[PDB]
Amino acid sequence: VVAAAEKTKQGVLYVGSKTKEGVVHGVATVAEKTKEQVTNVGGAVVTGVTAVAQKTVEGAGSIAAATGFVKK
Amino acid sequence: VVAAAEKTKQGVLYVGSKTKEGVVHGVATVAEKTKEQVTNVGGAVVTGVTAVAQKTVEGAGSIAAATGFVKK
Amino acid sequence: VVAAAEKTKQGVLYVGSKTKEGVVHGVATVAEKTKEQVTNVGGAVVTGVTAVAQKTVEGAGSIAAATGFVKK
Amino acid sequence: VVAAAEKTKQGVLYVGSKTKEGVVHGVATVAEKTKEQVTNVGGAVVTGVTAVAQKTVEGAGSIAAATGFVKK
Amino acid sequence: VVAAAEKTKQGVLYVGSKTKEGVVHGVATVAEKTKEQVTNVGGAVVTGVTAVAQKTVEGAGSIAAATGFVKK
Amino acid sequence: VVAAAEKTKQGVLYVGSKTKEGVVHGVATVAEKTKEQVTNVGGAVVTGVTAVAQKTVEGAGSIAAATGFVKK
Amino acid sequence: VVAAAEKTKQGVLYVGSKTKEGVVHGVATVAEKTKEQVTNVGGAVVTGVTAVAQKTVEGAGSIAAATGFVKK
Amino acid sequence: VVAAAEKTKQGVLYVGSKTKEGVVHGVATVAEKTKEQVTNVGGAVVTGVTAVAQKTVEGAGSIAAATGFVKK
Amino acid sequence: VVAAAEKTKQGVLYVGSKTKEGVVHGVATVAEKTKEQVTNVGGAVVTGVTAVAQKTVEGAGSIAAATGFVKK
Amino acid sequence: VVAAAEKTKQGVLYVGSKTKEGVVHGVATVAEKTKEQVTNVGGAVVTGVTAVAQKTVEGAGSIAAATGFVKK
Amino acid sequence: VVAAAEKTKQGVLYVGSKTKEGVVHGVATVAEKTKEQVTNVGGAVVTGVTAVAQKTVEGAGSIAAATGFVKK
Amino acid sequence: VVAAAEKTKQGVLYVGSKTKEGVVHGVATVAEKTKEQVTNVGGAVVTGVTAVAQKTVEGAGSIAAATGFVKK
Secondary structure: OOOEEEEOOOOOOEEEEEEOOOEOOOOEEOOOOOOOOEEEEEEEEEEOOOOOOOOOOOOOEEOOOOOOOOOO | OOEEEEEEEOOOOEEEOOOOOOOOOEEEEEEOOOOOEEEEEEEEEOOOOEEEEEEEOOOEOOEOOOOOEOOO | EEOOOOOEEEEEEEEEEOOOOOEEEEEEOOOOOOOOOEEOOOOOOOOOOOEEEOOOOOOOOOEEEEHHHHHH | OEEEEEEEEOOEEEOOOOOOOOOOOOOEEEEOOOOOEEEEEEEEEOOOOOOOEOOOOOOOEOOEEEOOOOEE | OOEEEEEEEOOEEEEEEEOOOOEEOOOOEEEOOOOOOOOEEOOOOOOOOOOOEEEEOOOOEEEOOEEEEEEO | EEEEEEEEOOOOEEEEEEEOOOEEOOOOEEEEEEEEOEEEEEEEEEOOOEEOOOOOOOOEOOOOOOOOOOOO | OEEEEEEEEEOOOEEEEOOOEEEEEOOOOOOOOOOEEEEOOOEEOOOOEEEEOOOOEEEEEOOOOOEEEEOO | OOEEEEEEEEEOEEEEEEEOOOEEEOOOOOEOOOOOOEEEEOOOOOOOOOOEEOOEEEEEEEEEEEOOOOOO | OEEEEEEEOOEEEEEEOOOOOOOEOEEEEEEEEOOOEEOOOHHHHHHHOEEEOOOOOOEEEEEEEEOOOOEE | OOOEEEEEEEEEOEEEEEEOOOOEEEEOEEEEEOOEEEEOOOOOHHHHHHHEEEEOOOOEEEEEEEEEEEEE | EEEEEEEEOOOEEEEEEEOOOOOEOOOOOOOEEEEEEEEOOOOEEEEOOOOEEEOOOOEEEEEEEOEEEEEO | OOEEEEEEEEEOEEEEEOOOEEEEOOOOEEEEEOEEEEOOOOOEEEEEOOEEEEEOEOOEEEEEEEOOOOOO
16 A cells, blocks of 8 residues: 655646535435444545535645454 | 656646535445444545536645455 | 655645535434444544635645454 | 655645535434444544635645554 | 654745534534443544634644554 | 654745634533443544634644553 | 495314425516506405415305596 | 494314425515506405415404595 | 494414514515605505414404595 | 494414514615605504414404595 | 494413514615605504414404595 | 593403514614605504514404695
């Protein structure tokens, strides 16, 4: 799980939103009458109404992520 | 799970949205009358109403992600 | 889980939002009449109404994250 | 879980929001009539109404995070 | 869990918000009629209405965090 | 859990907020009719209405934090 | 112009309404550059969304209306 | 112009209303550059969203209305 | 102009209202550059959202209305 | 102009209201550059949100109204 | 102009109101550059949010109203 | 102009009000650059938020009103 970013160096931007009812659900585990519940989150959960990513990682960057689940 | 990005160097942008009812569900595990529930999230879950990615990774970048599930 | 970012060096930006009802849920574990509940979060959970990331990691940066789950 | 950031060196920005009802929930573990509940958070949970990250990690930076869960 | 940041060196910014009802919940463990409850938080939980991070880690910085959970 | 930051050296900023009802909850453990409750917090919990971080860690800085939980 | 009613003497009623975003306009004389305009409403104008009239005239009832438009 | 009612003598009523964002306008003379405009309402104008009239005239009742528009 | 009512002698009522953001306007003469404008309301104008009239005339009742518009 | 009522002699009432952000306007003569404007209200104007009239005329009742607009 | 009522002789009432942020305006002559403007209200104007009138005329009652607008 | 009432002879009332931030305006002649403006209110103007009138006329009652606008 190796991430390497390298950089050797020798306008009008717009996002517009006009909502009127903005019910947003992300990673949801909805249940009734269970016994066991495990929610393992290790990535990148971005929730919103205007989830706007503008000019991200313009240079160098690494988001190296790793999860796991062992059951025995 | 190796990600490598390298860069050696020697206008009007618009997104517009006008909603009136914005019910959004992402990764959902809806259930009734169960016993076991496992939700392993390790990637990149982006939920929204205006999920706008503009001019991303313009240089170098790596989002090297790894998950797993072992049951025994 | 190694993340390396390196950089050797030798306009109008806009986000606009006008909501009127902004009910947002992120990583949710909703349940009724259970026995066990485990919520292991180790990544990056960003929730909001205007979740705006502008000009992030313009230079170098690393968000190397690792989680785990062992059951025996 | 090693994160390394290095940098060797030799405009109008706007976010606007106008809400009228801003109910936001982040990482939530809602339950009724259980026995055990564990919430292990070790990443980065950013909740808000205007969760705005502007010009972050412009130089070098590392957010190397690690979690775990052992049950026996 | 090593984080290293190094830097060797040889405009108008705006965030505006106008809410009218700002109910925000962060990391929440809401329950009824249980026996055990453990909440282990060791990362970075940032809650607010205007959670604004502007020009953070402009030089060098490290937020190396580690958590754990052992049950036997 | 080592964090190292090093730096060897050889505009208008604005955040504005106008709320009218600002109910904010951070890390909350709300329960009824339990037996045991443990809340171990060792990271960085920042709660507010205008939680504004401006020009933080402009030079060098390290927020190396570590938690734990042992049950036997 | 004359109305008379003589009376000599010698049951669940349910209206359930569950409307949403109802807009009601009555006698509206919207106009521009209005040289001559006349509205002479002189009768019953029921202008509901759910207009219910149950058991209106159970006994002796009389309604008389004389609405003249004299013009020379 | 004359109305008379002589009376000589010798049950659940339910209106449930659950509206939302209701807008009600009555007799409205909206105008611009208005040289001559006349509104002469002289009768019953019920302008509800849920307009209910239950058991209006149980005994002796009389309604008389004379609404003239004389013009030369 | 004359109204008379002689009376000689010899039950759950429920109105439940649960509205939200109701806007009510009556007789409104909105105007601009108004040379001549006349409103001559002389009758009953019920302008509710939930307009209920239960058991209005149980005994002897009389209503007389004479609303003239004389103009030369 | 004359009204008479002679009377010779020889039950749960419930109105529940749970409104929110109600705006009520009556007889409003909003105007600008107003050369001539006249409003001559002379009758009953009920302008509620929840306008309830239960058991209004149980005995002898009389209402007379004479509202003239004489103009030369 | 004359009103008479002779009477010769020989029950839970509940109004529950739970409003919030109610704004009430009566007879309002809002104006600017007002050359001539006249309001001649001479009748009953009920301008509530929850306008309730229970058992208004139980015995002998009489209401007379003469509201003239004489103009030359 | 004359009103008479002769009477010869030979129960829980509940109004619960729980308002919040109520704003009440009566007869308001707001104006600017006011050349001529006249308000001639001569009748009953109830301008409450919760306007309740229970058992108003139980015995003999008489109301007479003569409100003239003479102008030359």
